Every structure is written in structure tokens, then in C-alpha cells.
Design an enzyme around this catalytic site. Sequence first.
Site, short mmCIF file in Angstrom:
data_model
loop_
_atom_site.label_atom_id
_atom_site.label_comp_id
_atom_site.label_asym_id
_atom_site.label_seq_id
_atom_site.Cartn_x
_atom_site.Cartn_y
_atom_site.Cartn_z
N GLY A 119 0.82 -1.23 0.00
CA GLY A 119 0.00 0.00 0.00
C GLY A 119 0.84 1.26 0.00
O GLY A 119 1.96 1.22 0.55
N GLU A 120 0.31 2.36 -0.57
CA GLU A 120 0.92 3.70 -0.50
C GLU A 120 -0.15 4.74 -0.17
O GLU A 120 -1.27 4.63 -0.67
CB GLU A 120 1.53 4.09 -1.83
CG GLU A 120 2.01 2.93 -2.66
CD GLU A 120 2.74 3.42 -3.89
OE1 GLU A 120 2.42 4.50 -4.34
OE2 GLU A 120 3.66 2.76 -4.33
N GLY A 121 0.24 5.78 0.55
CA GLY A 121 -0.59 6.97 0.79
C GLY A 121 0.29 8.20 0.93
O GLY A 121 1.51 8.10 0.69
N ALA A 122 -0.31 9.33 1.33
CA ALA A 122 0.43 10.54 1.77
C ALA A 122 1.26 10.20 3.02
O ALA A 122 2.21 10.91 3.29
CB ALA A 122 -0.52 11.68 2.04
N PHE A 123 0.92 9.16 3.76
CA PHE A 123 1.64 8.79 5.00
C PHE A 123 3.01 8.14 4.67
O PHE A 123 3.89 8.10 5.57
CB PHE A 123 0.79 7.84 5.86
CG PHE A 123 0.65 6.46 5.26
CD1 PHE A 123 1.70 5.54 5.32
CD2 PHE A 123 -0.51 6.07 4.60
CE1 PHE A 123 1.60 4.29 4.72
CE2 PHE A 123 -0.61 4.81 4.02
CZ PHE A 123 0.44 3.92 4.09
N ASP B 31 -10.14 8.24 13.24
CA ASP B 31 -9.96 8.16 11.75
C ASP B 31 -10.38 6.80 11.22
O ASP B 31 -9.69 6.23 10.33
CB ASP B 31 -8.52 8.59 11.39
CG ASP B 31 -8.34 8.95 9.90
OD1 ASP B 31 -9.31 9.27 9.22
OD2 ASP B 31 -7.21 8.95 9.46
N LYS C 283 5.74 -0.60 7.57
CA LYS C 283 5.32 0.77 7.18
C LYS C 283 6.53 1.68 7.22
O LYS C 283 7.08 1.86 8.28
CB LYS C 283 4.22 1.34 8.07
CG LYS C 283 3.65 2.68 7.56
CD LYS C 283 2.26 3.07 8.13
CE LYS C 283 2.16 3.00 9.64
NZ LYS C 283 0.85 3.51 10.12
C1 LIG Z 1 -1.65 -1.14 3.87
C2 LIG Z 1 -2.43 -1.34 5.16
N1 LIG Z 1 -1.60 -1.51 6.39
C3 LIG Z 1 -1.39 -0.49 7.27
C4 LIG Z 1 -1.69 0.83 7.02
C5 LIG Z 1 -1.42 1.87 7.95
C6 LIG Z 1 -1.80 3.26 7.54
O1 LIG Z 1 -0.86 1.69 9.05
S1 LIG Z 1 -0.60 -1.06 8.71
C7 LIG Z 1 -0.58 -2.70 8.08
C8 LIG Z 1 -0.18 -3.87 8.73
C9 LIG Z 1 -0.25 -5.08 8.07
C10 LIG Z 1 -0.71 -5.13 6.76
O2 LIG Z 1 -0.62 -6.37 6.18
C11 LIG Z 1 -1.07 -6.50 4.83
C12 LIG Z 1 -1.18 -3.98 6.13
C13 LIG Z 1 -1.12 -2.75 6.81
#
Ligand SMILES: CCN1/C(=C/C(C)=O)Sc2ccc(OC)cc21
EC number: 2.7.12.1
Length: 339
Positions: free
Chosen positions: A23-27, A143, A46
Amino acid sequence: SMHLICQSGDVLSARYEIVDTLGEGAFGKVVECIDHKAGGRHVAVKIVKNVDRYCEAARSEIQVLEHLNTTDPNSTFRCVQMLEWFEHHGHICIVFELLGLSTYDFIKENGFLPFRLDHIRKMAYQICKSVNFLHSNKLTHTDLKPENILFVQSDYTEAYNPKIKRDERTLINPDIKVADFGSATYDDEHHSTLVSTRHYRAPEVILALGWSQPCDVWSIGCILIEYYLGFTVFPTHDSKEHLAMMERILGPLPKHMIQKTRKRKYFHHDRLDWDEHSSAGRYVSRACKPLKEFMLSQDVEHERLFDLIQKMLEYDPAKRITLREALKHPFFDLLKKSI
Ligand SMILES: CCN1/C(=C/C(C)=O)Sc2ccc(OC)cc21
């Protein structure tokens, strides 16, 4: 910063080998890694953007997860488990257990089709249980949204649905965890004016009347609607437009909330400063209607979901149902029928 420190085959903290992007975001970015010092276990890491606001959120998240993971070592209340944290080229990096797709990413990859009701019941029960545990611990998440609710394991079967003429993916196991503790706030610490992502934000937050645990209950109500329809009933990026959609879907704001609010910019005397005939006015009245008109069936189990949603979207945050009360609501009786 971010683009330059995160490619496949990079080893972090001398043990975590990146194999994929989750995953990607502004974070920042979440990557999947092999842990060479725990027998090759796969984890999520992360990598946080090196920007004051997200640095401060990550440091707060580490302190919340240390508390929650110690208080609930068996993860009985389904918060994401943090394994450790470190720094990489001066970026904060948080290691978690590896889970599956977010509820948002599942809906996206299913062509924005909704969940079937039986999955919504199990998912709603687990979310209320997890966030009630936070509330017990004098915390408010602030949130909650479909991107922050994670499936444990997102394996699916797929078949043609001739009813809607759409290919449809169904989960094998809909079990969830709650994530993203970077904005979570204790009762006795400073409360920011602005909390929550637009489409999940409570009226006491918009009107700056003070907020606490009940703003989490509003967010969960909005999440259940999105799970049921595959879209938000608040498609807007404006505070006053949002309030006008609320009045069309739920009824007029309570008189005591309009007359206490310092947010006078939204109001002309004792009513919303709203032109029904403007561009935004036309849009709202085309796109919004009374909540129960969004129901897809009149079956009793649909009526039981919509009674809980209506209680969670009570305008007065003291009157609003608590998550402890929600876990006892008749929509969950099917989950409690003898094994
Ligand atoms: C991408 C979601 N994601 C997080 C997002 C944030 C903003 O913290 S923290 C996280 C932990 C495990 C995971 O496994 C797949 C995914 C995961």
C-alpha cells in the site's frame, strides 16, 4: 525521500528483505518483507514519510500499540500487532504481523460491488468489539474508514451473478483487524479541532462542539452504509455541503447544536446558509434522499441493519448508542444462535 529507499531486494535493519508493495498513501508506503532473523516469517513494514505531521503520528502510534499489544497479548480484541520499530535513512519504520487487503482495496478490486449481508454482520460485530476495547482504555481512534479495517486473509471465490450481470468475488473468511493508530487520542490529552477523513466525520466535529468516543460510532455507521451500497451517501469535499447532505438524509440538525456552535459561517440566523437552486444545491437534492430509501430489500435482517445504522447516526453525541450497547443490538442475534 520515499521513492528512493524502498525497492524489491533492499534489506532493512539487517534482517527485513523487501519482496512486494502492499500500500501507498500521503503517510508513506507499506512493504511485504522476509524476516531472516525469525525463520523467514513474512511481515509488513510501514515506511513513514519524513514530514513533521507523519513523524509525530508514527511516534504516537508506536506508544498506543505498545500499550494495546501489552494489554491484549492474545489479540482477543483484533487490533493489529506491532513486532518492533527502527529507523532507515532517518525514516521511522514500523514492523507488523502480515494481514490481507484493506476492506477498501477488496471493494475496489471487486469493481466497487458491496458485501453480502451475512459478511457485513460478522464484520460489523468485530469492528464494534475492537473499537469498544479502545474506548475501555480511555482512547478514541478518530480516523476509522474502510482503508483502516484490514482482512486477516483476503482469499476469495469468483462467479458470474446473472442478477446484476457482474462477476463477483466472495471472501472465504471475512475476519478483520483494526489499524492506523497515528491519530488516536487519550481522554486527558489535547483534542485537535480537525479529526476524521471527510466522509466519516461526525457533526459535533464539524460544528466544533467538543468530541470523544461517540465520533468513532458515527464513523462506523458511515462505514456500514459503504459496505452495504459500495459507495458513500456523503460524496462531497466541503463542510457546509456535508451538513446539507446530512439534513436531506437524516433530518434537520437539532436546534441546541446550531445555537451553541461557534461555526457561524455555515448558518444564516438559525438555519443552514444553503441555496437549494445553486450548483451544489442541485447536486445535493439529486444525489441525497431519506436514509431508509437506500435499502435494497424490506426483509427483516435489512430492517435490523438499518435500525442500528440510524442509532449510530443520532446527531446528539450523548444520546448516540455506545459500542457496548451496539454489541447487544438485534442485528447480531444471528451470530449468537447456538453453535
Ligand atoms: C496497507 C495497510 N496496512 C497499514 C496501514 C497503515 C496506515 O498503518 S498497517 C498494516 C499492517 C499489516 C498489513 O498487512 C497486509 C497492512 C497494513
